[PDB]
């Protein structure tokens, strides 16, 4: 195995798990969510109003009160992802997320956000330890 092919595989490994995380969010599967996220997950994101939050407590609200409750359609597009492999057990993904969705008044709309996720493999499982979202 060349290190080029090796690097491609690892990079794909991080894309797949990032995509699964996003699926768990969209479906409102908090058990899947907690399984993929490190319990010490920290987050910068618009809803946290410029503060760094412990993501596991702060995100419970969106699952209890929105994401599981919805059956309205939403299509997520991940654009131009870039993965930094930082040794055997650490990685980092930066990507643009376009989300098509339907608004309360019925119309369909799009939103863009720019997202960073930092990944740590512990005991054979990749876990998200940090998340930065802007939009």
């Amino acid at each position: 195995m060349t290190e080029d092919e090796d690097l491609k595989v690892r990079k794909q490994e991080i894309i797949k798990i990032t995509e699964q995380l996003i699926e768990a969010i969209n479906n409102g599967d908090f058990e899947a969510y907690t399984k993929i996220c490190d319990p010490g997950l920290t987050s910068f994101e618009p809803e946290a109003l410029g503060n760094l939050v412990e993501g596991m407590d702060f995100h419970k609200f969106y699952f209890e009160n929105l994401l599981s409750k919805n059956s309205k359609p939403i299509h997520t597009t991940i654009l131009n992802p870039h993965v930094h492999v930082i040794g055997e057990d650490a990685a980092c993904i930066a990507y643009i997320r376009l989300t098509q969705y339907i608004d309360g008044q019925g119309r369909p709309r799009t939103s863009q956000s720019e997202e960073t996720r930092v990944w740590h493999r512990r005991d054979g499982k990749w876990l998200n330890v940090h998340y930065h979202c802007s939009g």
Copy 2:
């Protein structure tokens, strides 16, 4: 050495280098900047308008045309930093940056931004591989 004290030291290691990076930016020292940044540095930041940029090319403009040129005072404050140690050679810092500065019309002002920097130690030197800034 307990792993608690060990972890504290590594965490401090990342704070010091993040602070030095910020000093190099404020002074407009691009040579210091390039020494601390990985050549493959990627960045999400307000000036990149929602796109991911190769940070070394995109940042040259701010050094050539602003940061070295200035002697106007600026005080940076780093608030509530949080460091994730992700194995021997990988780390990640999230912090709030308050910058006090003087505006073109003379008045002093403050700006807040929320910042993530991902770090990789290669050949004994810590290098910044990703940067996410919102504000």
Copy 3:
């Protein structure tokens, strides 16, 4: 016969652009996918300054809007211009006025400026790129 040749090809590109727009208005995704290249790229307002692979991105508007709509709309194509770029390539630029009826009862117009790039593969014209501003 050289000039008349050019006229014909130009009209060929207008007809197919017009059919594409009919497919969109009727919410016919099968017609749409038959006229669009599977690798279609798009710049457009709903993509928020990004270039998208148009076939995945457009599915949403067919599933959730264009097919479930009984409301009248009249499209007007203004001042089209066609560049014939060899036997198998062309390019159309036009203004699109759309008359429609809005939420609060009333009728409105929107203008957009549109570029479509065309490629003939195995005798069928296919849209490979689309740029929309408005």
Copy 4:
């Protein structure tokens, strides 16, 4: 593979020429501009206010009164270009353009625009026949 390498080369051909066109615009070289553009160039762009213009007449103004005038720095970045090769003599490039520049108030700013250029090779030279720009 060689089918593939061929395609890669053509695609790079169109990127190089697009980049050269942009250099000509930034430097205010109208002679270089007119050499790279088809005389029948059409344009959709923000300054044309929703109209399609014949780009060679409409663009003269910006060369005469702006682009040739300026020694103010500007860095252009081309992000995520995509090229469609549409046969031996036709191609098409879509890209995002970020422009770093300096404003009247003194300060540096960024602008994004999304750009389509359509290309036609006539007598061995690639010429831009259509241009669609959106932004601001």
Copy 5:
């Protein structure tokens, strides 16, 4: 015969009458009346055309199909300070201000002003509107 002046008065009145009839047909949503008074090649500049020149017969269909016909709501049109240029035996041109009193969605009554030019061509004894320019809002 008649005074050159009284002749001119007559013609001018002719163009006012026909312009007024056109406006009635529009208000009543009478498309057949409308098409009878408009040249099939009518061109139009108007707010709803967003700065473009449109072939008025296709572009106006939409407002008859979806608004003007189907309306029960009262509207009073006032034509202010019309001016007619008689441009030979078979050509004329009218410029006028149109105030429209009407009732709005939230119930209330409102006024709108628009400034309007209509160019007229008599073909086979019948005056037809060939161009229309409307500005307002």
Copy 6:
């Protein structure tokens, strides 16, 4: 016929040429040229008249005395998609879009669009503008 279509083409071009000359006269601030091409009874709807119909010769004097003649700053006018209605031997009508590139107060170059109607009347062998309707921001 072959001869007739060609005749119509020529008259249409006649009206474009004179409209273009009128625009040159305005750009250059040549009021004498302007008054020679305009009917003394010219009426105008235009943004600077604020919804009113004005007698154009008096109203336009101000812009010639205080702006158009004084001006050394560059301006490029583009006429888009003109359409001419020939309304008999002595009457015509042109509708066009005018893009004007120009340089502003803070130094920068800008564009403005306006949609324009001019009505024409040939008197004693000379085409004269009798009405003008201009709409734009």
Copy 7:
């Protein structure tokens, strides 16, 4: 003189009473009363006429047909600081501020101010409003 000052007072009062009666007719939606008090040639400058001078009798019909009549919502009109110019035996002129308290769509009560001029002409022993200028 003393009995010319009292004479002037009376005439001024005459013009206030008739102006007040006109306003009552408007508030009640009584168009017959309105047309009896207004000259058929009444001209009007007012906010609903959009900067134009209108023949008031045709233009006001709309507000009687479609609003002032079918109203039963309360409204209190206050006339502040009236001033009357007596311009000979048969002509006068009143300038006044009108405050109107009323109830809005949201159910809330509101006030509006307008400044009003009415010009009066006595023809055949009856005072008639010939002109009206309202701003607000």
Copy 8:
């Protein structure tokens, strides 16, 4: 009757000429001319009086002292669609639109529209403005 229609025309013209002369006096900043044409008891509703009725002669002094005089910047006034009501031998009333072309602070030329009412009273053979209502 025929010679009452011509009589009416003349009087109406009389009122336009004097209104035009008043405006000339205002544009030139001639306060002496102004006070000769206005009744000392002139009242005024106008935008600069902020919804209040002012005694026009004291309130207008400020604009003559501080503006209309020391002006040499060009201004072209157009009076559109005047309408005159003759209210007996000694009273009249004019309603008109005033377009004013002028040059602004930035150096640019601009237009303003205002709708104006002037009420006139002839005392001792001279027409005097007793009331003024301006909106815009």
Copy 9:
């Protein structure tokens, strides 16, 4: 003196009590109570009078007929930092800030501040409000 300071304190409290009662009457929509505490010549500057001085008894009738009496919705008034000027045996003056907590149209609770002056005149043993100045958003 000891007795004098105490005298002044009592009169000041007299003026606060009656101001508070006036405010109760307004909140409850009791117009008879209101008219008993107000001088019939009461003048008022207040936001709803739009910069004008009004005769308060006529102007305030509207708010009693159409709002204050109809109202079942809760409101808490807070009077902050009152200041009383005793201006002789029969005249006084109170300035205070009024915070009003209340519930709005979209259901939510809100606060409004206003700054208020009331001038008082004792006639025949009864304090009456003769002037009122209210300022606030």
Copy 10:
């Protein structure tokens, strides 16, 4: 003696005169005149106090030191529709609208309206302003 009515007229005029003198002292930036006419315990509600009641003598010093004194620029004050309440031999109260014509920074002349209440107390033969309420803008 004098008519109860003529007596009342006199007193009312007394309060207008003194209010006018206060306004002149303010316009001229005469602080010594100002302090002579104002009670040392003067309280004020006014726009510059941002909804607070201030002790007017300390708060107004700033405008005399830094503005009203040092001004050469013309200003015409108009007092409209004053109303005076005579509240016994030694107490009064005036409500009036103040229109101020003035010249602005960018050169131009402007008007401002404010609605004003002044409460007056005669002590030792001299009328002194004890309270001031100003609303506007």
Copy 11:
């Protein structure tokens, strides 16, 4: 060290009680609220419009008409608290409060406020004597 552990304990004491106060407010328990607050509590807060209020009277309204009324979910997060121990019987806490909640339009939203509470222990019970809230 034990000097230090002592300080840590007191600081936690003040966090627990502050958190309990916030629970009482969210649940709309006024009885619990009045037990934790000094009767002389003063407050600076957005709803008091720049004024200092006696918090016990002013806060009654929100309990009567809002907080006790609601079964709509809300999650409060206290970020980066800082406690000053100011002697045996006085303390002071500064913290950021993020509140996740659901709005009228249906949607969930966040609000930040910065909060200071000053504490006084009287007869063995900690009481809030002052409160300063900034935000929105």
Copy 12:
């Protein structure tokens, strides 16, 4: 003597708060640091919703504004209220009106609401916390 005691301590806190404000207005940082606890924390508008260690954060305003300023300013303290929290602790809440002169010539007012918490250590009152809204 119990009530009079309370009055005195309350006035003690007003005087020192007033001195603090004088130090700020004059740009006297040495006076400022002598009256402020080195661990002073602050909530204030220029901190953008964050809690800052006031001694580092305030240095900038002294270095670049408060000392280099000859322009007049009048501070008014309205309706102060002092809570005495034992022998060594107190707390003051007040409204601060500041009259000042602005860039384009003119004079203006600003209001802010201010809390300062005080701790007496070794006989000297020190500000430990500061909350400013406006």
